[PDB]
Structures are given as C-alpha cells and as structure tokens.
Symmetry: D2
Subunit: 457 residues, 4 copies
C-alpha cells in the first residue's frame, strides 16, 4: 500500500496511503496541465514541467524536514498526526493556480476584473475545501488517525496564514507553521524545491544546498515562542541563497522576450473573454474572468484555453486568433529601451495605466514626421527585492552557538562582511513598441529618450 | 542573423538563419504540444518533455558529426550545402507524429483503418512538403545556396528511404545517408539523443558516450560503398550501447501500467471517433482517422483532443468521457498474468483478433460461480529485440586498424568475448482484463494457466 | 563529539564519537598516502583519490543499510551496539593495504617471498589488533555499551571469515553479509567502488543502490535469516554485474597500467635488501619482511617510490634507472594477446615457464639479433563475475509481493533469453623488456609461432 | 600523432606532439606530487587532486579560446604558430610551485628568507628555461615550425609579464597577452579551470558558465590597440563570477582549520630546516630555503619532504617530528575569536611579526589564572577582495553593442543595478592559541577581548 514514485530531482518518494487517496482526484490531477513557467517556455525550450511534481517534491521536503526536527529533538512531542498534516498542507499548497501559473493572477485578473483582489492562495484554500467535501475524504481521515475538526483548520492556516492568532495548534507548536510557507523571513521548503527543479530543467547551475541547512537546524525559545533556529556560521549561506534567488529572477523569470510573450497572451485572453463559455455547478455558464467564483467551472480551467482559441473557427474570435498566429510567427512586440534602475520614485499599481500617455505626450526637441499615439506603447514595471520590501530578511532570523545550543542571538549586517549590497529593493521600467517598421522604432526611441530626460530618470 | 538557443542536454546551440526561418512556422511549432513518450508521463512524473527539443538536438548532433567527419578527412569534399541539407533533414525527421507519439500509429491507426499501411515517416515527408510549399522557403534556399530541385529530394531520401536507388547525391557521397537514420545496423544520432534526453528526464543512468565515438569515427571504403567505420577498441562501447538501449526499453517503454494506460486512451479515442470534427482545406470536415489524408486538418491534431473529450458536455461522447474519468481516478484495468518467454511462439501480424478469445475458451474441471465472457480482453505482443529483425547488428559494423586506417575489416562476435548474449531477440505476450470484479479476477487466473500451461503457447 | 564530513560522492556524513576517536590514530591516517588505483593514475589523470574517503564511505553505507533494515522490520531486535559494530567493521576493513594497494599483494609478495601465502585481509586484522591495543580504545569501547571480548571477535569475523561464527548467535546471521559477502558479492564495497570510480575516472555508472536498499527484506531460507531481494528487480542485478565487468575491462585491466605496475614491481624487487625500515626495538626490516611487524608496516607507504626515485646512493642505481625510464614514458613494448580458446587454463605454477616457450620457438627466418627468455614478461588476466563460472545470483533468495515472509528462488531462464552464457574467461598478454625498434618485427614472428604451436 | 587523454572535467582533449614531448620530462612530471589545495586536504577529504590535470586543462582551455576567437574573426591573421605558443604558455604556467602550493610562497619563504622577494611565476620562468635547455627541445621546435628566439621570449612574457613594453609580438597582436594571464582585469582561463576543478572535487556546485562567455567574445580596437570585449548584456554574469570567486575563497580557501594546519606545517618546516640536505648541480648541498637558487635542487623538492620529516629517525629532527605527530593525532592549535571586518585601516605585511607581542601586552582589568607570554599566541591576517586592491575590475572591461559590433563602450556600476557591493576589499584578524587546557583558553580569550576593546573599533 506504501506506494513509491520516482522523481528526477529527489530519489524515491515514499507515499502514505492517505496521500495516495488524496492525489487520485480530478482536482489534483488538474495540475498536470498547468505549466511552471508560462511565457518562459518559448525562450527556454527545456522548461516544460508542470506543478504536479513540484507539489510532490514540496510535500516530500516538508516531511523530511519535520522528520529530521523530530528525530534530533525528542522533547518537542511530535506525532504522526502532525507529520501527516504538514505533508498534506505541503502537497496542496498550489491547487489555486490558473492558466500559465503567475500570469493569470498577475496580468490578466487585474486587467479584466479590477474590482476584486484575488491571489492564488485563496484559490488553493477554496479548491482544497471543494476537494475534501466532494471526494469523501473525511472518513479516511478518521480512519488513519486525523481529527478533521481541527486538522482541516490547521491545513488551511498553513497555506494562507491566520484568518498568536492561530487556532489549529497551540502556542508551543509554532515551529510547525514555518515549514511550507514562512511569513517572517521567507525561508521554506518551497523555495528549495523550485530552486532545484528550475535549475535542473532550465540548464542553469544552482548554488544553495538545503541538506546542510537541515543538518544544522534547531528549535529555540525565541520571545516565549518556539521557532526554527540556524547555526550562527551559516549567515553567508543565507546571503548566497538570496543572491541565487535574485540571479534566477534576473536571468530567467524576468526575461524581456518572455515578459512580452506573456503580455501578448494576456491581450489575446482579454480579447477572447466574452465568447468562451464554461459550465459550472447546476448547469450555470461562466467566463474566464468569472470562473474564479465557482470551483466546478474552475476545475476545467487549464492551459487548454490557449489551443481552444488558437484552433477555433468562430468568427467572433478572429482578433485573438490573429494575435496567437503572430505569436507563432515570432512577430513579437519590439523592445525600445529600459530606464536605468529608478533614481528615486516608486510607481504604484494604479499608475501603470497612465505611463503610455506620458510617453506619447512627450515632445522631442527635434521634430519627427512620424506620429505615435498612446495606444501603441507598452510600459512594463519590474520589481526586484529580497521578498520584504526594502527590509533585510536576515534581520528576522535567529542563530545559536555551539557552546550554548539552547540560546538564540541576532547577527547584524556589519558583523558578516563589507562586500554586501547596501539596498534590498529596485525598480526597472521597460518600454515596448507595437509598430515594427524602422521609422516607427526610431520615432519610439526618440520619444523614449525625451520622456526619460523629462522625468529626470 | 545567427541565433543561440540554450539546451539542458547539449548546451548552447548555434542556428543558421535558414534553420530559424524553417523553425518559425506552425507546422514545426505544433511539436510543442506532442509529448515524447505519451502514456509514460502517468507512470514517470518527469517525462513531460516534447519533440521540439528532440528535433533541435538531432539536428545539432547531425551537424556536429558532419563537421567532424569533414574536418578529419579533407578529401571527402564536404561542402556547406551538404551540411545544411543534413541539418535540415535531421531537424524535420519526427515532423509527422500525431497525438501521444507512437501510441497513434502503433495502436489507433491499425485498429481503426486496417486496410491502409501508414507510418509516421511518410507523414513526415508529406508535412515537410506542405511546410515548404505553404510558406515560401524555396527563394530563401536559393539565396543561401541550396538548389531545391535536388536538395529537397536529398532531404526526402534521408527521411523515408530509397523510395544505386538514391538520386540526390552520386555514389561518391554514399556515407551521407547513414547519419539521420541508419537501416543497415541502426547507429545514428537519433538513438544518441533519445538515450541522453530520456535518461536525463526519467532519472535513469546511461553509460554510452557519443563524443568518444565521434573522436574515433572514420570513413572506410567498403567495396564500392563509402561507409562510416568505428575503431577496433570500440566493440565494448558498441555492446554497452546496445545493452543500454535494451535496458532503457525494458525499464521504461514496456512498463506494466504505461501500456494499459495507452490501451485505455486508445479505446477512449476509438469510442469518441465519428463525433469529433476537424476542419480541413476548403471548408471540408474530417475525423481523427481520416485526418491523415489532409495535411491542413492534420496540422490541428495534437494532444488537445484528450482534454477536448475530457471536458466535453455533448451526450454523444459519454463513453469516452467515462473512460477518461476512470483514467483520472486511477481505476485502471487489472493485470491477468505474465505469459513468460515460453519458446517457439512467434505471433505475427496476422494474429490480431482471435488471441483474446482463446483465454476463456478453456474448460477446466472446476465449478466457478461466476462465468467469464470472452468479449472483454486486450492482448498485445511486445517485440523485444535489437531492432535488426532478430539478428546481431555487430556483423554490419565496419572497423579499421592503425596500420591500415583506410582499409575496412570485420570483427565477429567470437573474437570479442564469450559473455555476449546467445540470442538477440524474444517475444512476450501480455493479456489484460477489462473487467475488474474480484470474483472475475480469480476466474481469469484459472482460465489463464489453462491456456498457457496446458496448451504450451 | 558528533562531527560532520562533506564527501563528493555522498552527502554530509555523521560520525559517532567512537568512530572519531578511532579515526584520529596514526594507523588510520596512514591510509591517506596509498593510491586507490595504484598505477592507473599514470593513465587516467583524474584517478588520484585515496583509501581514506573509501573507508569513510563504506562505513557510512554499512550504517545506512543496517539502519534501513532495522527500520523496516521492528521484530529483528537490532540495537545500537550492532549498528556501531557494523560501522566499525566497515570503517577498518582496508587497513592492510601496502604501496599501490592491490599491486603489492598481487605482484610483489608472490615474487619476493614465494613460500608465504599472504592476503591483505590478514594484514587488516593485524592492523586492527595493533591499533586497538596501542591506542587505548577498549575503555572507550566499554563506555558505549560494547563488550570488547565478543565485539572485537565479531568485527574480526566481519572483516575476514572463520556454525563457525562465534561473535553473534545464529539468528543474527543477516549481519554477516553486509560489509563483505564471500557468497555472491552483493555488499557495500562494490557500491562504493562503482560510485567513486565512476565519479573520478570520468565514466558513467549504471547501478542505483538506493532502489536496492529500498526493496530489501529479511526472508528466512533454510532456517537462516538472510537479506532478500524483490522478484521483479533481477534485471537490476544483471545490469550491476555487466557494469562491474565493463568497469574492470575499461579501467582495471588497461595495458599501460599493467605494464607500469610491472615496472614498479621490478624496481621494488631490484631495490630490495638495501632499503631499511625500522621496527619495534630498533630492528630493521626489508620491504618484503616488514609484513611481519605492524609497527614497521605502518611506515610503509608510497613514499618508497619517491625515496628510490630521489636517492643519491650508488647501491640503488638500477631501480633509479628503471623509475627514470618510467618518467620518460619509455615503457615496455606490447606484441599481442591471445583469444579465449582451448578450454585449458594457465595457473600460477606456469607463470615462469611461459616466457621460455616463445623464445624456444623456431621462426621460419633466422634473426640476426638473438632473443633470450630472461627478458620476457607474460601476464594472464582473469575476467569473471566473481565466481568460478558459477552463476552469482543463484544463492540469493527473492520474495513476492503477495507473500513477503516466504522465499522463492528464481532461475536464469525465467528472467529472459538476453543474458550472458558464461561467468569466467581468461586473457594472456606478453611484454618484452627490450624496446629496441629492431626487435619489433622479430618479436611478432616469435609470438605468432608460439600460439600456433600450442594450438591457439 | 595527436595523443588523446581523458579528463573528469572536460572531455577527451587532444595534444600536439610538441606538447607530448614537453610533458614527458622530469620537470613537468614533478607536478604529480604537488597538491592543489595543500592544507585543505585535511578538511575536505575529496580534495586530493594535483597540478598536473590543472595545467593540462588550462592549456586545453587556452587553445580552445584562441581557436574560437580566430574562427569568429578571420581578419585577425591568427596562425598555427601563435595558437601553439599560447598552448605551450598555458601548459607551463605553474612549473614553479613548491610543496603544498601556496603554503610555500605565502608562509615559508617570507619567513625563512625575509630579505628576498620571490613569486612562483619567476620560478615557473626559470623552470621553463631549465626544461627547454636540459631536454633539447629547441631542434624539435625548429622542426615543427616555431622560431625559438622570438617564441621563447613570447612565452616568458605571457607567463610572468613584460619584464610598448612587450617584445615577443607586435602591437596589432596585443589580444594574445591577456588570455592565459590577464593583468588589466582578472579574467583568464586559469580561473575558468580551477573554479570547475575545485567545485567538482570539493563537493560544491559552480555558478559560472565559461562557454556562454566564449560564445559572446570579440576583438575590439580600444585605445589604438586590439583587446577582448564581452557583450553589453553580460555584465551581471561577470559580477556573479567575481561573487563566485569570493564565495569559494570564503568557504574553502580561508577555513580556520586549514589555515592553522598550514601554520603548523610551516613551523615544522622551519624547525626541520638546517638539517635537510638536497643535492643540486655539481654535488652541492642545498637547504629547503636556499634551494630556489638552483633548479636541479628544486626539481626534487616536493611533498615527499613532509613524509621524510615524519618518518625520520635522527635525533636532530625530533622537534619537527613531534609537531607532525601532534598534527596526526588531531591536537591542533586552539581558537580565540575574530575581528569585525572593516576598512578605513589596514595592517601592512611589515607588522605581521609584531601583532602577537601587542596581544600578549594587553592588560585585562581582572587578574587571570595564568600569565601568557608572546609565544603562546598566533595572529593571522586575511585579505579578501575582488583581485585589484579596492579597485573595481569591471571598470576595466570593455563591451560592445549588437547594432554596432566594432565599437567599444564602457558601463558604470550605476547602469547595472542598485544591489551591488559598495566596497571591494576588506580585512580580518584571527587569533589562535598554542595551549589546549581550559585555563589557558580562558586567559587567552580574556586577553584578546581586552586587546580588541583597547583600540576602539
Ligand atoms: N497512484 C498513483 N501512482 C502514480 C501516479 N503517478 C505516477 N505513479 C506511479 O506509477 C506506479 C503505478 O502504480 P499504479 O498505477 O497504482 O499501478 P499498480 O501498482 O498495478 O496498482 P496497485 O497494485 O493497486 O498498487 C506507482 O507505483 C507510482 O509510483 C499517480 O498519479 N497516482
Ligand atoms: N527565433 C526563435 N527563438 C527562440 C525560439 N525558442 C526559443 N528561442 C530563444 O528566444 C530568444 C528570442 O529570440 P527572438 O525571437 O529573435 O527575439 P529578440 O530578443 O527580439 O531577438 P531579435 O529578433 O533578433 O531582435 C532567442 O535568442 C532564442 O534563443 C524559437 O522557436 N524561435
Ligand atoms: N577529526 C577529524 N576531522 C576531519 C578529518 N577530515 C576532515 N575533517 C573535518 O574537518 C573538521 C575540523 O574539525 P576538528 O579537526 O575537530 O577541529 P575543530 O573545528 O576545532 O573542532 P573541535 O576541536 O571539536 O571544536 C571536522 O568537522 C571534520 O568534519 C579527520 O581526519 N579527522
Ligand atoms: N604520454 C603520456 N600519456 C599519458 C599521460 N598521462 C596519461 N596518459 C594517457 O595514457 C595513454 C598511454 O599513452 P602512451 O604512454 O604513449 O602509450 P602508447 O599509446 O602505447 O604509446 P605509443 O605506442 O607510442 O602510441 C595515452 O593515450 C594518454 O591518453 C602522460 O603523462 N604522458
Ligand atoms: N543567463 C543565461 N544563462 C544561460 N542561458 C541563458 C541565459 N540568458 C538567456 N539564456 C538562453 C535563453 C535562450 O535559450 C537563449 C537566448 O539568449 P539571450 O541572450 O537571452 O538572447 P536574446 O533573446 O536576449 O537576444 P539578443 O541577443 O538579440 O538580445 O539563451
Ligand atoms: N560552506 C561549506 N559548504 C560545504 N561543505 C563545507 C562548508 N564548510 C565546511 N564544509 C565541510 C568541511 C568539512 O569536511 C565539514 C565540516 O565543516 P564545518 O562545519 O565548518 O566544521 P568545523 O569543525 O570547522 O566547525 P564547527 O566545529 O564550528 O562545527 O564540512
Ligand atoms: N590559502 C589558500 C588556499 C587556496 N588557494 C589556492 C586554491 C586555488 O587552486 C589556487 C589558485 O591558484 P593561483 O593563486 O596561483 O591562481 P591565480 O594566480 O590566477 O590567482 P588569482 O585568480 O587570485 O589571480 O589558490 C589560495 O589562494 N590560498
Ligand atoms: Fe510553490
Ligand atoms: Fe527522432
Ligand atoms: Fe574496501
Ligand atoms: Fe594555474
Ligand atoms: Mg511564499
């Protein structure tokens, strides 16, 4: 009954029967058709993996971490119930992802439904609830030892945080809330998992080594609240981990061609929004933007919509079809130029829609015969940080010393090295053009340099 | 202009502008949605790679081999025209596959159109002709130095076969037809790419090294036939290559669960046929089985059909929908038994329908409460061999000595070692029980040994 | 003192304080200066690893396998003392190697003291005895629940063989085939060899011992508990044996490595009775005689090679000339090998008589330069699956998923017809000291005459 | 006769017969008994590699880079003679290393003979001249195509430096002087080789990718002389390369235990001096410290001296033998504490011998149990920078743009990112103790804390 599955990254993953029963559901098997990198597959031809193996690996890593922590410290009183709950929470932490992963919740939803705030963790929680109530998993849960009344709440809290504001587990079990997702300093098994998987698949070498971190992990009584500590001689390792994350974002996740491909795919989805019907619960009909209201219709919302629009013949989908055909001919939107890392100004989300008008309104000192409108400019804003919005993540980590392994201390930046970056946040503004002839590109470059000079960038 | 594509297997790759022109067409871009294995993805969760990178790697390897051969021996008169032709041929060799790769032409087409002999190489030739004719590539070929009226014929001969039978090149360049596909002994870059990619993705280890083979490769003048000859010390490497191929096939390609999943998918496709329509050229309508006769309809035929049937709501497609739902719940068909390599049994193409019937035709002297019917079975025969029609390909490999490297000699199996296999092929028979009832499972057990042990087949 | 060691092959290796105490001894640190492949470093530049990491990895793998076995079946009653003893036995299983490892006991001792039958496992047992007696480890052993009388005998029986075993009772018989398996050869030493050699040499491995460890049980056979394998993983074992044969043929039996080992052995033989090694009580021992004293054997490593190479004394001239000829790559020439035929096997006693046969042969055309049998070296290489033509996986017991507690042996025909047809072979190689270009044609004519004369 | 050798790092690398004859020399085979890391072998058990493979790989990499640069631009007039000279220069760039590599020329010679300044590049030049003269390579060089009079000077200049300053080649071939060893910036194939080798042997995973850098390399015309420029989009890769160098240094090359072991070995060597006799030319006897005055005595100075001292029997070498025995039982010098890395002040090499006196001269307020003399302390100074002593190496690198490839530009640190280090150099001080008992450790820590607080960090 103890199934074994072979993963290209890890070794052989040992699966509990309850996890096997949970996995064999349509809701979880939906993840087989949602790619890990939406627009990045058309730049790296090796990044064709999905979130299925990602969730499997995250669950495996959570189980390994909790097992090691329990083994090295027998007074924490960790039972099989807690291990099963942690593995279940780590297995179903990305059930709410939509088509093309982060594109759906970062580019399409704000542009189609700006009156709703929706992240993928909310969708994950609702999808997990739907799966549990639909597939009849509770009697198995009491069969195998779990108590659904508080275990469901614990698993829900492990994903979206509080909704000591927690209710699943008491105060002396706080170290169980910082495994799958950490809300304090952003160190978790999810980061390690996708670091390893993306580095293996893209063709880019990794730097971080999580096994050494697990070997030197401990639980301290920091501010009358138990939490995971780290050995004080691995501060440079954490800094290198964050540098590796920054390098991955710089090289692969924020590629210009991939970003513009995501933009064109989102444009096609927006143009093909009012002509796609999805059957919901009770025979109701939904839309692409409205499908995040009913899970019975959101279950069948995957990357198949791209080929549905591309292979269609309906006369009402002509524009989106043409956009996709231009995508497949590499008639991409041209790239004009990027502003230097912003001197000092922060652009909020609501200011994104006014930038093309500002770019087009700028009058060059030299008159241009060609004229351009605000509709033919794509302005993109990129944010780079350490996950804490100008804060130092290492300032929230606790370290211990070998002489007294029961005490936690804090380490400042000045005590590590002088070769560290001064700032922890950045912004980058990118401008693209729709017109492709050389004269329009030259005019767009003149407009861009004039606008950059005018706003003092 | 020159382009560079990163590959997790072969590293950075250089691309001629003509290759970039050929790549950016819908006929080539449809390979992004056809999987390399098919049903193995539901057994190995890391086998999600497609044929796009496969074609890229095969073309790259063919170019490298041609370059090395031309460099080492300058008297062979290898020009850039031949290198471009070989790279084009290797890039468009798997252009004619359909949904789920070998599942389509292996199971669905023979089981739905028994009166037509169809293989994916002829489909690849037709697709290449359509791609050339529908995109205007001949002027580009003439611009870059390729005479289409001979080079297209040369590429087609490299793809499908002879159709001195060859007419693309004179008999002097008789070694250029054994690079992309070899029909004499089976040594070609296609297998090298297969091994490297599949072992990287699945998690299996291979010991073959094609770089060493490239280093020691040479062109030997066998009687009136220039051929590629290995070196005398490479016999062990060749035997290791064939052993690795056999182990790969046994471990991955003929798994117990992958084959039955492929059979269930084929059954769902057969049930769903005549209710799925694909628009061809001129507004005509086609089906899945008839799509192969029109290239325009065949272009829009990929793995999208699986999700098209799965998410459908028409009452006409209830049976296929239920079969796919059973796939999604991991309620697969049960395994009856392993018929073993009994002996002289050499079931040929003619035996295709009556084999399943004679498993319940036995009349043992046992009283069974439940009676098992003969209309529900699946029986398949696996061809475990070296790919040389139950023969040793080592006798088809030339060699050369240091003293006389321009003279070809042959080394037999005896001179290598006595630990080589005595027989190079065998046949296995696998039978499947569509019914899943527990009582019928025991009934199928008794009716299995009676057909196998007593009838010694 | 729980320490952590980072290894290129495995991950971070944990060490019990007893293992750390045993490691920090001159006898164990002596292993840092003995080459794993010996003379193979002069053909493969990447083969520079030593026995220290090999011993550490073998101990780690033995501990891992014991822990897995104890975790899977809670009814075997495996305690911490047993796993500690297995780890110790796996750690100190190669303490007896000499200069260039296998070369010493394969070529030097038979040719230096033919009357002594000596293997390196006996040397390992003697070195373990010396280390334990000299470094005061017995109180430390007692401090962790180990009884020296029984447990030291158990470790010795694990290292070298003897129901003949006395360290443990007969119901713990599954603890005697982990570190070393004389029966069929399924142990952790071959796993470590495969992994480390494939990583360092530059060759790709095919075996995966983690899957094997995952599918290991203890199923009783003939009233004897044994480690059992799954019925559907026999192809993995066949691939393992094929990988072992390929690795041996590719690396361990290279012509240049063998001739370099032959030259080194000749230099050592010619340089004997001049080199003095100090022993207990101020005694002096030779290179061959130092195997009778462990304190003198401790100071015998690959340093002798450089001592002879850099020597200035006039008594060691010939060995220095041989080493210099090695340094200029003026190695002995290779004429040609035979092929497996005749069903006759050349044994040890025929080693010296073989060179005279080729010299005594009469070529068709007389040679101006005469050839003597005192300058011929002939080597015979045996290739097999670790057995004497016997099937290796015939004594291993399998099990079925339906009934795990019961063992069903599997034959060779049930697996497939794509399997080898033999489990033993032989090869014969001839080397000539005289590397002059004049004798290249003369040597070949003499060689081809001998094979036909002896019906090859 | 192009010999082929197998490297665990690279593939099968070919060697010219001239390189074959140069390698088969005692002066080159001496490198088989010199370690790459020296004292780091006792902390990382897998780091047992020597300089032989490193030299072979550096030669191979230099040859490959020259070949690629010549193929990209056929107008550089690169001939086979220049490629061969660069390969020879790369092969023999480390012939002057002493025992334990860097330990010798970093600790022993500055302490054994303080009145002479020596570097292993001068030793490499002397060894190359000795090899060429003793082995009679000049007629071989004349036969193959090299002119010894100019090529020997060219190789010597490539190895050590200018000694327009250069004379081996004219000013229009100036790009060949920065390949093996680059003085303008720290970018050369030496780093590209030992990065990969040390990563492969230490168990750490590399980050840099030299093949991509070689892809985007071009020859410019900067300051009226040809140079080598990267591409403007590859600046972050260079920053990551320097970060990787710093990380490797911090993690491995400056380990506390390795440094203390090197210090103990240096002390043992200093004590063993004046008792070891090495025979040079003419029967003269040379000490360890004065053996650098004759290459015949230096050829026999390898790691064998360590085991010669350890296995000695004479009563003269009792002290060094006792020190080595203390090392072998793992009774090392203890540890006290660090100092906070901070610039604005530096400790010159002249003050290295006075710091322990200052530490022992501190006056703790509370009387200690035992009084410690100046010989009971060890003080170590670590200089960690980017290789240019507070300068920015990227400020000396030239770049070129895709639109105009022949124009060289410069890029400022502000144009790259705001998450880069502000400084490029730092210093640390490490204090050790020569006693092991607890009271001495406590007293040493008190004295060190008082001294650290005395000078007001
Ligand atoms: N259950 C399950 N197994 C999977 C899945 N994906 C890959 N596998 C692997 O595929 C193998 C095949 O298992 P099954 O499909 O259940 O076939 P089976 O072993 O004959 O079925 P059982 O005898 O009931 O265990 C398993 O051992 C898994 O490791 C999945 O989504 N669900
Ligand atoms: N052309 C092309 N590039 C691909 C493809 N798949 C991945 N790539 C990579 O994606 C990168 C984007 O290339 P381009 O389509 O030319 O986009 P670009 O950055 O605007 O480059 P230019 O067209 O020259 O201006 C290329 O460098 C390729 O390495 C593909 O199918 N076609
Ligand atoms: N003891 C020991 N450690 C080794 C050896 N080889 C590598 N190491 C590693 O090197 C590290 C150095 O540790 P130690 O030699 O004990 O010195 P240390 O850092 O002061 O440790 P403590 O003295 O216990 O505080 C260890 O953690 C080991 O992981 C070896 O042969 N013996
Ligand atoms: N020459 C030489 N080869 C080495 C060295 N180290 C490893 N090798 C490898 O060992 C192999 C043996 O080469 P040789 O010693 O010349 O033996 P050989 O090939 O029989 O010599 P020839 O018959 O003259 O070709 C070579 O192919 C090299 O790849 C070395 O230091 N010098
Ligand atoms: N840092 C990187 N490391 C490895 N591969 C990379 C890296 N960045 C991009 N690649 C891969 C992605 C693609 O397969 C390929 C394209 O190279 P890239 O330099 O991104 O071209 P590009 O699209 O920016 O074109 P252009 O040269 O016109 O700017 O290289
Ligand atoms: N950053 C690193 N990454 C990988 N391996 C490392 C690293 N640092 C050290 N190692 C290796 C070197 C040794 O083989 C082993 C032990 O190192 P380390 O943890 O530093 O021990 P130590 O004895 O110096 O420290 P401590 O006693 O404070 O734990 O791990
Ligand atoms: N304390 C130590 C230990 C490690 N290294 C060693 C490890 C590397 O293998 C070697 C690098 O060799 P070189 O310093 O001779 O190479 P470069 O001359 O190019 O130095 P750099 O790259 O800093 O310019 O130094 C070191 O610098 N000193
Ligand atoms: Fe995630
Ligand atoms: Fe193919
Ligand atoms: Fe061993
Ligand atoms: Fe170097
Ligand atoms: Mg998070």
């Amino acid at each position: 009954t103890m199934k074994v599955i072979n993963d290209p990254i890890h070794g052989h993953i040992e699966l509990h029967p309850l996890l096997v029963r949970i996995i064999d559901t349509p809701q979880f098997q939906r993840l087989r058709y949602i790619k890990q990198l939406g627009g990045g597959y058309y730049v790296f031809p090796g990044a064709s993996h999905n979130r299925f193996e990602h969730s499997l690996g995250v669950g495996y890593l959570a189980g390994c971490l909790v097992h090691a922590l329990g083994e090295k410290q027998p007074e924490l009183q960790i039972s099989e119930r807690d291990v099963l709950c942690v593995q279940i929470a780590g297995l179903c932490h990305d059930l709410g992802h939509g088509p093309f992963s982060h594109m759906f919740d970062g580019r399409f939803i704000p542009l189609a439904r700006p009156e709703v705030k929706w992240t993928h963790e909310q969708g994950s929680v609702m999808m997990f609830e739907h799966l549990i109530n639909s597939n009849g998993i509770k009697p198995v849960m009491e069969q195998y030892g779990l108590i659904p009344e508080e275990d469901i709440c614990f698993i829900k809290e492990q994903i979206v945080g509080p909704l000591w504001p927690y209710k699943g587990r008491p105060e002396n079990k706080s170290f169980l809330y910082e495994i799958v997702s950490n809300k304090r300093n952003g160190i978790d098994v999810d980061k390690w998992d996708y670091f390893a998987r993306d580095c293996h698949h893209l063709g880019i070498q990794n730097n971080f080594d999580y096994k050494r971190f697990i070997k030197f992990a401990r639980v301290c009584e920091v501010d009358n609240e138990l939490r995971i500590c780290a050995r004080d001689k691995e501060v440079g390792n954490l800094y290198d981990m964050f540098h590796t994350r920054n390098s991955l974002h710089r090289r692969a996740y924020q590629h210009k061609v991939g970003n513009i491909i995501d933009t064109m795919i989102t444009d096609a989805f927006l143009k093909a929004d009012d002509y796609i019907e999805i059957t919901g619960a009770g025979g109701k009909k939904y839309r692409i933007s409205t499908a995040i209201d009913d899970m019975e219709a959101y279950t069948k919302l995957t990357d198949n919509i791209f080929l549905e629009i591309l292979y269609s013949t309906d006369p009402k989908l002509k524009d989106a079809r043409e956009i996709l055909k231009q995508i497949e001919y590499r008639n991409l939107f041209k790239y004009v130029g990027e502003t230097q890392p912003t001197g000092q100004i922060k652009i909020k989300r609501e200011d994104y829609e006014s930038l093309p008008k500002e770019v087009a309104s700028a009058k060059p000192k030299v008159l241009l015969d060609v004229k351009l409108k605000a509709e033919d400019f794509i302005v993109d804003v990129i944010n780079m940080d350490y996950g804490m919005q100008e804060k130092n993540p290492i300032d929230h980590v606790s370290f211990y010393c070998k002489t007294a392994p029961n005490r936690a201390i804090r380490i400042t930046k000045n005590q590590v090295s002088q070769l560290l970056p001064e700032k922890f946040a950045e912004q980058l503004i990118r401008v693209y053009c729709k017109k492709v002839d050389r004269k329009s590109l030259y005019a767009a470059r003149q407009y861009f340099v004039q606008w950059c000079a005018d706003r003092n960038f």
